Every structure is written in structure tokens, then in C-alpha cells.
Amino acid sequence: GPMDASVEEEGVRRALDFAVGEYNKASNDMYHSRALQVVRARKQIGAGVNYFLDVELGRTTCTKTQPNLDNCPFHDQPHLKRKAFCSFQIYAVPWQGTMTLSKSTCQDA
């Protein structure tokens, strides 16, 4: 590879959800962050599948306790949305049930 990939693919969508779940698990935020736009998606196939995803992330108005995490709009104030630009590397071995986050790097966008 790395050939191009698309958020239209199941694997990319599954990996993006994994990555954002991890990002949230690691955060000190009281609030759920979620993916705004997938900017670039590449995948490399071999021993497993390596997904490389570049993503804009934003803070939402829902808390992490909030039992529902699915009608969660982004903050409308820039200094509260705090848009971030993220590069994720996901190593998945789907035929063995493995999915791990190799690399996660986020700067302010």
C-alpha cells in the first residue's frame, strides 16, 4: 500500500469508531468528542490491515456519563468546540479479532 480508502468502507468506519472511542477513554474532558470530518483515509494490507486516518475532531455538548451519545451536536462557540486535527494509526487483524491503536497524534486545528 498504502492505497486510498474511504469512510464508505466498513473497515474504515469500524476503525474510526475504535480510534475515537480510545481518544475519549484517554481524555480528561467531561464531554464526548467525536469525529467531524475524515480528511484522508489510507489502508495497507499484509499481516493485518493498517488503517491511517486523518480526522477533524470536535467537542460536543454531551457529557461522557450522558447515557445517550447519539444526538450530540458540536459546540457552536469555537473556543468550546476546540477543533483538533488527528492522525490515527490502527492495526487490525479482523480475522483474528484484533484491533489496536498503534499511534494517535492530535494538534489544535
Side-chain angles (χ1 to χ4, degrees), residues 52-67:
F52 310 86
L53 322 178
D54 290 325
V55 201
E56 279 167 66
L57 257 57
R59 306 179 60 254
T60 69
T61 65
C62 326
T63 51
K64 288 173 179 193
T65 324
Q66 201 99 326

Side-chain angles (χ1 to χ4, degrees), residues 15 18-19 49-53 88-92 99-102:
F18 178 75
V49 188
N50 260 286
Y51 296 101
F52 310 86
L53 322 178
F88 301 126
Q89 193 172 158
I90 302 88
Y91 188 55
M99 188 142 51
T100 70
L101 186 61
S102 302

